[PDB]
Each structure stands twice: as C-alpha cells, then as structure tokens.
Structure 1
Amino acid sequence: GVKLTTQAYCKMVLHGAKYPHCAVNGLLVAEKHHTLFVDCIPLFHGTLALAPMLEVALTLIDSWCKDHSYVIAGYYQANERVKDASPNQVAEKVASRIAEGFSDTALIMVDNTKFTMDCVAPTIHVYEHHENRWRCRDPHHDYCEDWPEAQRISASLLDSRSYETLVDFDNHLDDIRNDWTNPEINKAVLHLC
C-alpha cells in the first residue's frame, strides 16, 4: 500500500470533478505504511500529449518541492471515456521519468465507473513499477490513512460545490495571480474534520 492522505484524495476528486468532460492529470509529492503522501498538485486538463508546458510545470514544481524538502513520488491520471481506466504512453513516460529520481513511485488511475457522488469505493487503481513495466498492485487494499473520514470529507466538499474555487497549473498560466497550492482547500479540509 501507499496510504494516501486525505488532502491529496480530496484535491484529486475535486480536480476530477471540476472538468467532467476533459482528461485531467497532476502530481503527487511525499515527505523526504510504505510512503505517505502529503498533498497533490493538479497540473493539466484537456489535451495532455504535449511536451513543453509539462516540462516547465515539472521543473517549477520540482524546484518548489526542493525548497520545502519534498519529493515527487506519484502521478495520477483520469481518462475521458467512462469505460477506460488503463494507462497510456504519456502516463508511462512521465512515471518512468519520475521513477529515476525516487524509488517505488506510484501510478494512480482514476476509475470513472466508481466516481459516485458521496462514496462507494476509493475509486483508485494503483500501479507499481516492476522491471520495465507496471503492474496493478490491487489486493483489494485500503490506500487511505482513514477511509471513513476521507470519504466523509470528500462527500461534504463535493456537496458544497467547492470545486469552483480549485485552481490548477493551467489556470495559473492563464493568469499569474492564481495559486496552484490551493490554500482554500487546505483550510476547508482542516476546519471540516
């Protein structure tokens, strides 16, 4: 297991729900169970098979994490079709690039079928790097620090229509004054426990 925290799960769900018709992806950081994640940074939505902006975002996020003593350890993606949950070339390339700087990196795929309103399941598939390929390490595990609190908080945030304030890196490139660290979501998840 990887034991995702609550903030990362809530931000991932909010980013996935903000643009239902598009494909979204972001980054997962961890502090320098197995490897406890701290939070996630949503990167892009729409068309994802383009190099330069992804490279710029990776460099900026890596520098910011290095300043605050973090390390990029996971990559989460969600496709567009409701019946498609397998990794593509872009996700494999990015995860392989990340793996060279940090061991046992995670490839997270969001499952659209289990994307219910409040909760039915963690709706997450976790892939681990074995030799030169990736395998679905899914022994029906619990990849969360505490499932009930996390699902309750995610359901409350979704019901409160709080995804209209989430801002990713694309919105930061559109207007510089936006913030990709999302302090409002952190405050909301701190107050709502």
Structure 2
Amino acid sequence: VKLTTQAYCKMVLHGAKYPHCAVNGLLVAEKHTLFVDCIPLFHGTLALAPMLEVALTLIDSWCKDHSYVIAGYYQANERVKDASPNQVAEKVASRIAEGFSDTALIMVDNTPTIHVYEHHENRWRCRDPHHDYCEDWPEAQRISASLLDSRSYETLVDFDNHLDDIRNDWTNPEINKAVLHL
C-alpha cells in the first residue's frame, strides 16, 4: 500500500523519459505490502501480448533469484487528462492476481498525481479520491526533483531499451545507486 522512494523515483523518471508516449511497468516487492521498486517494461503501443508475456518470465527469473515478488502494475495514459484504466491494465492485473494477492492497479495522473485501484469482488475501484497513503511525501518530492533537474531520465533504461541492446540493465543499478546517497 506504500511505495518506496526508489519505486516512485523510477516511476517518475520513466514517465518523464517518454512524455509523448505511454508508460508501463511492474512494481516488484520482497516476499502491509511495500513497493520497493519497479521494472519499467515498454512505451508507446502497449496493446500487444507477446512482448508483455515475455517480460513476465524474464522478470520472474530475476526476482526468484533476487528474493523478490511482483506485487503491482502501473500505467500512464498518453493523454494528460484521461487516467481511466484500459482493458490492458485489467488484463495484466488479473494475471498477477493469480500469483500474488493484493494487486494494485496504478494510474499515473499527469495533472497526489497517482491513483491506486484495488479489486474487491466487483471491479477495480480507486482510492485517491478519498486518500492515498505513502511513506513520506516531502522526501519523495525532493529526491524526485533532485534527479529530474539533472536530466537523469536520459540515463534511465527500461525493458524496451533492453530488448534493443542487452548491454542495458533493466534493473536500473545506476539509478537506485544514486538514490541511496540522496
């Protein structure tokens, strides 16, 4: 229900690296739930099955060895006003629900600025209209800007950039390595 400064900073960095395009990834955690970090998957046209179902296994193979487990899924729509979840968000959340309970469907509202929908027997209903819980807002807002002003998103890499060149690390070592000292 809470996100770590690393998860939030990686989310905002991937969202800023491709503003014109959509943003998607998988929030993975340790095995009440805290989102330690996210693995950003793709951008642009996301309504495609094979590359999305490859990321499932190619991230599980890393998390099972790194003692991690995938907990949630975030999406950022192309438009700046529309933040309603598409069919893809539901179809991916239902897939992780069968392997890990308490799945959170995150919608990055471009114009806080984050919605969290939870499934309770009927649908996916958000909680941001009522209230959204985080560990500490000012710390995250400071450390995010600290990496934003330096234009560090140009250095960030996601799974789509990794499928182009394997020399790129989808786990973002050089990002959280700077996050720890800030």
Q: Same fold (TM over 0.5)?
A: yes
Equivalent residues of 2:112, 2:128 under 8 A apart:
no
Equivalent residues of 1:75, 1:108 under 8 A apart:
yes
Structure 1 gap ranges (5+): 113-120
Aligned-partner Cα distance in 1 for 2:30–2:39? 14
Deviations 1:12-66 (A, max 9, x none): 000000011001100001110x201111100000100111111111111012111
Equivalent residues of 1:111, 1:124 under 8 A apart:
yes
User: SS at the partner of 2:3?
Assistant: coil
Alignment of 1:82-161 (within 5 A): 82-112=80-110, 122-138=112-128, 140-161=130-151
Equivalent residues of 2:114, 2:128 under 8 A apart:
no
Equivalent residues of 1:25, 1:78 under 8 A apart:
yes
Structure 2 gap ranges (5+): none
Give how far 1:138 is off.
2.8
**Could you say if the C-alpha distance between residues 63 and 9 of structure 1 is closer, same or farther in structure 2, counting changes exceeding 3 Å?**
same
Aligned-partner Cα distance in 2 for 1:56–1:132? 29
Equivalent residues of 1:65, 1:71 under 8 A apart:
yes
Equivalent residues of 1:6, 1:144 under 8 A apart:
no
Aligned-partner Cα distance in 2 for 1:3–1:141? 12
Aligned-partner Cα distance in 2 for 1:28–1:70? 10
Aligned-partner Cα distance in 1 for 2:108–2:60? 23
CA RMSD of aligned residues (A): 1.3
Deviations 1:98-117 (A, max 9, x none): 011111110000001xxxxx
Aligned-partner Cα distance in 1 for 2:144–2:94? 30
After TM superposition, the score normalised by the length of structure 2 is 0.96
Give how far 1:137 is off.
2.1
**Could you say if the C-alpha distance between residues 4 and 95 of structure 1 is closer, same or farther in structure 2, counting changes exceeding 3 Å?**
same
Equivalent residues of 2:21, 2:78 under 8 A apart:
yes
Equivalent residues of 1:8, 1:37 under 8 A apart:
yes
Aligned-partner Cα distance in 2 for 1:122–1:190? 23
Aligned-partner Cα distance in 1 for 2:122–2:3? 25
**Could you say if the C-alpha distance between residues 8 and 147 of structure 1 is closer, same or farther in structure 2, counting changes exceeding 3 Å?**
same
User: SS at the partner of 1:162?
Assistant: coil
Deviations 1:104-158 (A, max 9, x none): 110000001xxxxxxxx93110000111411112364343211111110001111
Aligned-partner Cα distance in 2 for 1:123–1:168? 22
After TM superposition, the score normalised by the length of structure 1 is 0.91
State the partner residue of 1:118: none
